[PDB]
Amino acid sequence: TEALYQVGKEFTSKMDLEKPNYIVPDYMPVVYDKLPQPPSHREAIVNSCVFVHQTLHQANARLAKRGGRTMAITPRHYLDFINHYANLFHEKRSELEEQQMHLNVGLRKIKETVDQVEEVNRSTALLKSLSAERERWEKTSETFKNQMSTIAGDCLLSAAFIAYAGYFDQQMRQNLFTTWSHHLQQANIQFRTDIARTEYLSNADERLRWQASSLPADDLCTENAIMLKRFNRYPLIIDPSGQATEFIMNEYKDRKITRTSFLDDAFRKNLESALRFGNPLLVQDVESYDPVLNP
Amino acid sequence: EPPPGVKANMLRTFSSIPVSRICKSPNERARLYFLLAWFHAIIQERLRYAPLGWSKKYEFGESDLRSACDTVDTWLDDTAKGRQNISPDKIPWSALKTLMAQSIYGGRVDNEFDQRLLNTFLERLFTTRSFDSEFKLACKVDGHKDIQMPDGIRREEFVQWVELLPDTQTPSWLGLPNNAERVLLTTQGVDMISKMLKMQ
Amino acid sequence: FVNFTVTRSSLQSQCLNEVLKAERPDVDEKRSDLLKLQGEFQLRLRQLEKSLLQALNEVKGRILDDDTIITTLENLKREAAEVTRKVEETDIVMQEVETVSQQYLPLSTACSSIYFTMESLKQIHFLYQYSLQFFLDIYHNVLYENPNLKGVTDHTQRLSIITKDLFQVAFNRVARGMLHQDHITFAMLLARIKLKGTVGEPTYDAEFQHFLRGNEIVLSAGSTPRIQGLTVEQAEAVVRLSCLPAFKDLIAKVQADEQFGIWLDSSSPEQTVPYLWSEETPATPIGQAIHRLLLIQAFRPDRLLAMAHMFVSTNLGESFMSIMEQPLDLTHIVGTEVKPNTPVLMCSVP
């Protein structure tokens, strides 16, 4: 727990986790023994990250006692979690500032246009046509502070789901996400419960293209596609039906992806080519994994 | 796997053996095959009641049935030298009974009491009396009723008789007491429950 | 790790779309065209919003100074309004498609339940491994090459025939690759699934819940009395079964029936289970079947399987399990049901 906490602290230094208006809950969901008694918002964030990491050990234990098949939880999962947290936090902050900048510029231009028409028929008709857009932009600009407040918790939950939830099925994914959300609730960490995970970590254009690439219209499939897009460690795909293979090949036709297998004689050569020319590579039969990929 | 019961066993037997095989020149041949099938079924069905039907789990299987069929054909052709009808008392009952007692279904037996039981079934089943109208394959299955010998002389009649057998088979069909299945059934019932409980 | 596991909703959608294609090809084609139209419509609306925002963001001075900006804004607003109009039109046509496809939801639910039961079948034996393609082959068999749909044209009767044949073919193909002792168990589950698909039948959750487990009801020394005519195990079974509201007066009903002992020693009591449960309204024949199943489990466990078969015969028909008694007709299965890519595994007991 010490190592996880210190890694979280040092890695989230670039993060803007300072919330001076944060209130310490009376019952703090403490998982770090030497966490300061009046924790700060950043301290609560890293403590919740450590809790998220330990929750995967608890879940693996629960599936192990029921005879289920579990995959080992490693500190590299925690490193992927914190890396995704930093990247998603920065991305969401940048997108939200850019959207607010565009909305403010649009609103000031509409106000300037009203002043110009005051100081004619066509522009009055245009302003009448733009009233709904102006109202929507003012409302979205009003929601800016709430979005800013919920960014940290939303990104933490999204990164946890990306790092840890890939191997598990729908029920266990929901269980882990509910556990993390409840822990954030006990820690007074702000997050949204309305937006879906797939809607939050993917846009409609990407989902439409995924549907074009023959990705099945399913929430778990969309989550899998998001993991295949935002991965830190190279993905290992488990698909008995195998439609994931066609989805990957369709998504990477333009970049000239090559299908191969660990049991193929040319695999090494293929791998070398994929490494030298920077082309996407798809290797099947990972049950016969060749340790030459270890580096 | 072994057929679920005597009816299924005999249906599988009659399906496995070609029609032209059974319908050769001696009209009596079909009955012999039926008898063999019944015998085979009974023998196999006594394996399910592992300690009681036989003292040991023997591998009475398709090879034994095929060997018995070949022996029946060989000795029937030897006796009925290309004749349309062979008198039932002229059928080589001694040859078939001895060959099945010592070699076919007999070489697997390593216990004198299981050998006595096999001799028992062979003596009761393979006689001239099997060709009578009132021959009785089994006696007092449910206390009152019992299983009659079909009055068929062609294969299709025997197949119909097997197909018309009820779905109320009891170990008394095999000569065993009716309670010989009780415990087994109970276990399987409990087993079913467990499997059901394991799939929720 | 990125695991692609089958979810109930996704399989339900797949089966609903497949039955819509098979039964209502015009409706399925219209639905596909509508989803494509709305996808590109939302795409166009997003592009129009982005273009409007960027046109406002990339204009210098005042908007009225450059009439080209005004014309572009007017064109964008006009196109947005008319694409939105097409959006409501596509929405109403989707309402038509949805009210058409509402009829086939129970079949898709049954399909998903059957597939997940087949997947759970691996828990009882290592040999019971079934892919999604196997169940999809069963479903295609039921939908497209079903001899019972040869001359039937009414959609409701076709759907009923398809629903019946789904259960029948699923049992046949799965049980051909199962040990006979397990067949009833599978049949039981199918019956329960078909029991959930009946609108007019109750849930029977408590009766099945006591059917399973049951022994977890701890009975003390004083809790279980000594009933004349029953053994200790039978007495505890009566006590546990009395926990139901319907069997609350079970000891009194058994004691008041002097003929009951005769029924306790009959060869096939499951055929003549006496009316020992108290109920205000008459139970359905399937409800009567569960009540007899409970009574048999309490009193004659050795005949439980037989009663279970009767239960299946009540839910799925008399001849539902009859194919397993027949010899394996391997010729037709190899010629028609087995693809050349699919190996025919023949697993035999010693």
PDB file of C-alpha atoms in Angstrom, chain C residues 102-270:
ATOM      1  CA  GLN C 102     -42.507  -6.194 -30.366  1.00  0.00           C
ATOM      2  CA  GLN C 103     -44.067  -9.587 -31.139  1.00  0.00           C
ATOM      3  CA  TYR C 104     -40.759 -11.479 -31.451  1.00  0.00           C
ATOM      4  CA  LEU C 105     -39.112 -10.391 -28.176  1.00  0.00           C
ATOM      5  CA  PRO C 106     -40.163 -13.517 -26.186  1.00  0.00           C
ATOM      6  CA  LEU C 107     -38.520 -15.761 -28.788  1.00  0.00           C
ATOM      7  CA  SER C 108     -35.250 -13.820 -28.499  1.00  0.00           C
ATOM      8  CA  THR C 109     -35.443 -14.004 -24.699  1.00  0.00           C
ATOM      9  CA  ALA C 110     -35.963 -17.770 -24.917  1.00  0.00           C
ATOM     10  CA  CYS C 111     -33.027 -17.984 -27.337  1.00  0.00           C
ATOM     11  CA  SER C 112     -30.717 -16.161 -24.925  1.00  0.00           C
ATOM     12  CA  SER C 113     -31.896 -18.259 -21.972  1.00  0.00           C
ATOM     13  CA  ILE C 114     -31.366 -21.508 -23.900  1.00  0.00           C
ATOM     14  CA  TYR C 115     -27.886 -20.465 -25.020  1.00  0.00           C
ATOM     15  CA  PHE C 116     -26.831 -19.473 -21.509  1.00  0.00           C
ATOM     16  CA  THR C 117     -28.206 -22.758 -20.150  1.00  0.00           C
ATOM     17  CA  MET C 118     -26.090 -24.597 -22.729  1.00  0.00           C
ATOM     18  CA  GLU C 119     -23.057 -22.575 -21.632  1.00  0.00           C
ATOM     19  CA  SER C 120     -23.756 -23.397 -17.966  1.00  0.00           C
ATOM     20  CA  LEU C 121     -24.006 -27.086 -18.917  1.00  0.00           C
ATOM     21  CA  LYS C 122     -20.192 -27.252 -18.787  1.00  0.00           C
ATOM     22  CA  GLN C 123     -20.420 -27.069 -14.979  1.00  0.00           C
ATOM     23  CA  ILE C 124     -21.909 -30.576 -14.724  1.00  0.00           C
ATOM     24  CA  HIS C 125     -19.576 -32.365 -17.170  1.00  0.00           C
ATOM     25  CA  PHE C 126     -16.340 -31.395 -18.905  1.00  0.00           C
ATOM     26  CA  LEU C 127     -17.606 -32.856 -22.197  1.00  0.00           C
ATOM     27  CA  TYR C 128     -20.511 -30.376 -22.439  1.00  0.00           C
ATOM     28  CA  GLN C 129     -18.670 -27.692 -24.397  1.00  0.00           C
ATOM     29  CA  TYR C 130     -20.848 -25.659 -26.764  1.00  0.00           C
ATOM     30  CA  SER C 131     -19.961 -22.598 -28.822  1.00  0.00           C
ATOM     31  CA  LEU C 132     -22.277 -19.777 -29.842  1.00  0.00           C
ATOM     32  CA  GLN C 133     -22.111 -21.014 -33.439  1.00  0.00           C
ATOM     33  CA  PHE C 134     -23.701 -24.312 -32.359  1.00  0.00           C
ATOM     34  CA  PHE C 135     -26.735 -22.545 -30.894  1.00  0.00           C
ATOM     35  CA  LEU C 136     -26.864 -20.278 -33.947  1.00  0.00           C
ATOM     36  CA  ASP C 137     -26.925 -23.382 -36.158  1.00  0.00           C
ATOM     37  CA  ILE C 138     -29.815 -24.709 -34.061  1.00  0.00           C
ATOM     38  CA  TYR C 139     -31.620 -21.373 -34.452  1.00  0.00           C
ATOM     39  CA  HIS C 140     -31.039 -21.328 -38.222  1.00  0.00           C
ATOM     40  CA  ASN C 141     -32.341 -24.906 -38.397  1.00  0.00           C
ATOM     41  CA  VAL C 142     -35.502 -23.829 -36.580  1.00  0.00           C
ATOM     42  CA  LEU C 143     -35.986 -20.704 -38.697  1.00  0.00           C
ATOM     43  CA  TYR C 144     -35.134 -21.633 -42.294  1.00  0.00           C
ATOM     44  CA  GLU C 145     -35.171 -25.440 -42.703  1.00  0.00           C
ATOM     45  CA  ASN C 146     -38.075 -26.310 -40.395  1.00  0.00           C
ATOM     46  CA  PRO C 147     -40.480 -28.815 -42.015  1.00  0.00           C
ATOM     47  CA  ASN C 148     -43.337 -27.589 -39.789  1.00  0.00           C
ATOM     48  CA  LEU C 149     -43.346 -24.152 -41.487  1.00  0.00           C
ATOM     49  CA  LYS C 150     -43.834 -25.559 -44.995  1.00  0.00           C
ATOM     50  CA  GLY C 151     -47.414 -24.435 -45.593  1.00  0.00           C
ATOM     51  CA  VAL C 152     -48.181 -22.146 -42.659  1.00  0.00           C
ATOM     52  CA  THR C 153     -48.499 -18.453 -43.542  1.00  0.00           C
ATOM     53  CA  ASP C 154     -50.053 -16.811 -40.468  1.00  0.00           C
ATOM     54  CA  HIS C 155     -47.303 -15.002 -38.571  1.00  0.00           C
ATOM     55  CA  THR C 156     -48.603 -15.891 -35.098  1.00  0.00           C
ATOM     56  CA  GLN C 157     -48.795 -19.616 -35.857  1.00  0.00           C
ATOM     57  CA  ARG C 158     -45.372 -19.522 -37.529  1.00  0.00           C
ATOM     58  CA  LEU C 159     -43.942 -17.867 -34.412  1.00  0.00           C
ATOM     59  CA  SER C 160     -45.544 -20.479 -32.148  1.00  0.00           C
ATOM     60  CA  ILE C 161     -44.172 -23.304 -34.313  1.00  0.00           C
ATOM     61  CA  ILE C 162     -40.722 -21.684 -34.298  1.00  0.00           C
ATOM     62  CA  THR C 163     -40.819 -21.323 -30.506  1.00  0.00           C
ATOM     63  CA  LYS C 164     -41.764 -24.988 -30.044  1.00  0.00           C
ATOM     64  CA  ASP C 165     -39.186 -26.248 -32.543  1.00  0.00           C
ATOM     65  CA  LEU C 166     -36.441 -24.140 -30.953  1.00  0.00           C
ATOM     66  CA  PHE C 167     -36.788 -26.002 -27.657  1.00  0.00           C
ATOM     67  CA  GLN C 168     -37.219 -29.359 -29.396  1.00  0.00           C
ATOM     68  CA  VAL C 169     -34.181 -29.046 -31.684  1.00  0.00           C
ATOM     69  CA  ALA C 170     -32.042 -27.545 -28.916  1.00  0.00           C
ATOM     70  CA  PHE C 171     -32.780 -30.524 -26.681  1.00  0.00           C
ATOM     71  CA  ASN C 172     -32.230 -33.022 -29.497  1.00  0.00           C
ATOM     72  CA  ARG C 173     -28.864 -31.672 -30.633  1.00  0.00           C
ATOM     73  CA  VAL C 174     -27.515 -30.972 -27.138  1.00  0.00           C
ATOM     74  CA  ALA C 175     -28.661 -34.294 -25.641  1.00  0.00           C
ATOM     75  CA  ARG C 176     -27.186 -36.290 -28.526  1.00  0.00           C
ATOM     76  CA  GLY C 177     -23.858 -35.143 -27.069  1.00  0.00           C
ATOM     77  CA  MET C 178     -24.772 -35.718 -23.420  1.00  0.00           C
ATOM     78  CA  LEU C 179     -24.787 -38.678 -21.079  1.00  0.00           C
ATOM     79  CA  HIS C 180     -28.322 -40.046 -20.853  1.00  0.00           C
ATOM     80  CA  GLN C 181     -28.440 -39.551 -17.070  1.00  0.00           C
ATOM     81  CA  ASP C 182     -28.082 -35.784 -17.581  1.00  0.00           C
ATOM     82  CA  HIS C 183     -30.766 -35.526 -20.289  1.00  0.00           C
ATOM     83  CA  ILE C 184     -33.653 -34.976 -17.867  1.00  0.00           C
ATOM     84  CA  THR C 185     -31.692 -32.209 -16.138  1.00  0.00           C
ATOM     85  CA  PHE C 186     -31.319 -30.339 -19.421  1.00  0.00           C
ATOM     86  CA  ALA C 187     -34.968 -31.016 -20.225  1.00  0.00           C
ATOM     87  CA  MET C 188     -35.899 -29.715 -16.780  1.00  0.00           C
ATOM     88  CA  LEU C 189     -34.122 -26.429 -17.432  1.00  0.00           C
ATOM     89  CA  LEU C 190     -35.735 -26.094 -20.850  1.00  0.00           C
ATOM     90  CA  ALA C 191     -39.141 -26.668 -19.279  1.00  0.00           C
ATOM     91  CA  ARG C 192     -38.404 -23.987 -16.696  1.00  0.00           C
ATOM     92  CA  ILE C 193     -37.379 -21.625 -19.486  1.00  0.00           C
ATOM     93  CA  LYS C 194     -40.573 -22.462 -21.360  1.00  0.00           C
ATOM     94  CA  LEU C 195     -42.326 -22.026 -18.023  1.00  0.00           C
ATOM     95  CA  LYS C 196     -41.058 -18.441 -17.840  1.00  0.00           C
ATOM     96  CA  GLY C 197     -42.261 -17.693 -21.374  1.00  0.00           C
ATOM     97  CA  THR C 198     -45.914 -18.393 -20.544  1.00  0.00           C
ATOM     98  CA  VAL C 199     -47.826 -15.225 -19.665  1.00  0.00           C
ATOM     99  CA  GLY C 200     -50.721 -17.069 -18.023  1.00  0.00           C
ATOM    100  CA  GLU C 201     -48.590 -19.076 -15.617  1.00  0.00           C
ATOM    101  CA  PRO C 202     -47.316 -17.871 -12.220  1.00  0.00           C
ATOM    102  CA  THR C 203     -43.667 -17.639 -11.250  1.00  0.00           C
ATOM    103  CA  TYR C 204     -43.401 -20.754  -9.032  1.00  0.00           C
ATOM    104  CA  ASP C 205     -40.232 -19.217  -7.589  1.00  0.00           C
ATOM    105  CA  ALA C 206     -40.828 -20.510  -4.055  1.00  0.00           C
ATOM    106  CA  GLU C 207     -41.809 -23.997  -5.234  1.00  0.00           C
ATOM    107  CA  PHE C 208     -38.677 -24.363  -7.375  1.00  0.00           C
ATOM    108  CA  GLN C 209     -36.597 -22.747  -4.621  1.00  0.00           C
ATOM    109  CA  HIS C 210     -37.701 -25.440  -2.172  1.00  0.00           C
ATOM    110  CA  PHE C 211     -37.297 -28.004  -4.967  1.00  0.00           C
ATOM    111  CA  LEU C 212     -33.602 -27.145  -5.005  1.00  0.00           C
ATOM    112  CA  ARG C 213     -31.602 -26.858  -1.781  1.00  0.00           C
ATOM    113  CA  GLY C 214     -34.384 -27.656   0.682  1.00  0.00           C
ATOM    114  CA  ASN C 215     -32.098 -29.615   2.993  1.00  0.00           C
ATOM    115  CA  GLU C 216     -30.769 -26.245   4.203  1.00  0.00           C
ATOM    116  CA  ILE C 217     -33.956 -25.917   6.293  1.00  0.00           C
ATOM    117  CA  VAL C 218     -32.513 -26.931   9.660  1.00  0.00           C
ATOM    118  CA  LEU C 219     -34.869 -29.010  11.813  1.00  0.00           C
ATOM    119  CA  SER C 220     -34.325 -29.471  15.543  1.00  0.00           C
ATOM    120  CA  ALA C 221     -35.098 -32.596  17.563  1.00  0.00           C
ATOM    121  CA  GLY C 222     -38.408 -31.142  18.742  1.00  0.00           C
ATOM    122  CA  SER C 223     -39.160 -29.546  15.373  1.00  0.00           C
ATOM    123  CA  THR C 224     -39.575 -32.928  13.659  1.00  0.00           C
ATOM    124  CA  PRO C 225     -42.304 -35.065  15.279  1.00  0.00           C
ATOM    125  CA  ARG C 226     -42.913 -38.792  14.814  1.00  0.00           C
ATOM    126  CA  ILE C 227     -45.625 -39.344  12.201  1.00  0.00           C
ATOM    127  CA  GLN C 228     -47.070 -42.853  12.160  1.00  0.00           C
ATOM    128  CA  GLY C 229     -46.442 -44.550   8.821  1.00  0.00           C
ATOM    129  CA  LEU C 230     -43.397 -42.484   7.799  1.00  0.00           C
ATOM    130  CA  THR C 231     -39.682 -42.906   8.434  1.00  0.00           C
ATOM    131  CA  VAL C 232     -37.424 -40.305  10.050  1.00  0.00           C
ATOM    132  CA  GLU C 233     -36.158 -39.081   6.674  1.00  0.00           C
ATOM    133  CA  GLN C 234     -39.712 -38.968   5.323  1.00  0.00           C
ATOM    134  CA  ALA C 235     -40.884 -37.159   8.465  1.00  0.00           C
ATOM    135  CA  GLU C 236     -38.211 -34.476   8.100  1.00  0.00           C
ATOM    136  CA  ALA C 237     -39.105 -34.168   4.410  1.00  0.00           C
ATOM    137  CA  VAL C 238     -42.741 -33.546   5.383  1.00  0.00           C
ATOM    138  CA  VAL C 239     -41.657 -30.978   7.979  1.00  0.00           C
ATOM    139  CA  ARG C 240     -39.508 -29.115   5.447  1.00  0.00           C
ATOM    140  CA  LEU C 241     -42.208 -29.237   2.758  1.00  0.00           C
ATOM    141  CA  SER C 242     -44.716 -27.857   5.286  1.00  0.00           C
ATOM    142  CA  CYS C 243     -42.848 -24.525   5.191  1.00  0.00           C
ATOM    143  CA  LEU C 244     -44.888 -23.632   2.107  1.00  0.00           C
ATOM    144  CA  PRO C 245     -48.296 -21.989   2.595  1.00  0.00           C
ATOM    145  CA  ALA C 246     -49.801 -24.726   0.409  1.00  0.00           C
ATOM    146  CA  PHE C 247     -48.333 -27.568   2.505  1.00  0.00           C
ATOM    147  CA  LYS C 248     -48.753 -25.932   5.927  1.00  0.00           C
ATOM    148  CA  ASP C 249     -51.371 -28.522   6.963  1.00  0.00           C
ATOM    149  CA  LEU C 250     -49.470 -31.411   5.376  1.00  0.00           C
ATOM    150  CA  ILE C 251     -49.041 -33.584   8.482  1.00  0.00           C
ATOM    151  CA  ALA C 252     -52.758 -33.364   9.277  1.00  0.00           C
ATOM    152  CA  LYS C 253     -53.714 -34.137   5.671  1.00  0.00           C
ATOM    153  CA  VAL C 254     -51.417 -37.180   5.579  1.00  0.00           C
ATOM    154  CA  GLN C 255     -52.686 -38.448   8.942  1.00  0.00           C
ATOM    155  CA  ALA C 256     -56.336 -37.997   7.929  1.00  0.00           C
ATOM    156  CA  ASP C 257     -55.702 -40.102   4.787  1.00  0.00           C
ATOM    157  CA  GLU C 258     -55.526 -43.766   5.776  1.00  0.00           C
ATOM    158  CA  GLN C 259     -55.114 -44.817   2.130  1.00  0.00           C
ATOM    159  CA  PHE C 260     -51.945 -42.687   1.949  1.00  0.00           C
ATOM    160  CA  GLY C 261     -49.829 -45.564   3.251  1.00  0.00           C
ATOM    161  CA  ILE C 262     -50.921 -47.686   0.296  1.00  0.00           C
ATOM    162  CA  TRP C 263     -49.817 -44.894  -2.037  1.00  0.00           C
ATOM    163  CA  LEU C 264     -46.508 -44.816  -0.158  1.00  0.00           C
ATOM    164  CA  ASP C 265     -45.880 -48.441  -1.201  1.00  0.00           C
ATOM    165  CA  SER C 266     -47.127 -48.340  -4.798  1.00  0.00           C
ATOM    166  CA  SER C 267     -44.816 -49.179  -7.689  1.00  0.00           C
ATOM    167  CA  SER C 268     -45.484 -45.907  -9.563  1.00  0.00           C
ATOM    168  CA  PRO C 269     -46.889 -43.380  -7.067  1.00  0.00           C
ATOM    169  CA  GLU C 270     -45.962 -40.460  -9.358  1.00  0.00           C
TER     170      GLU C 270
END
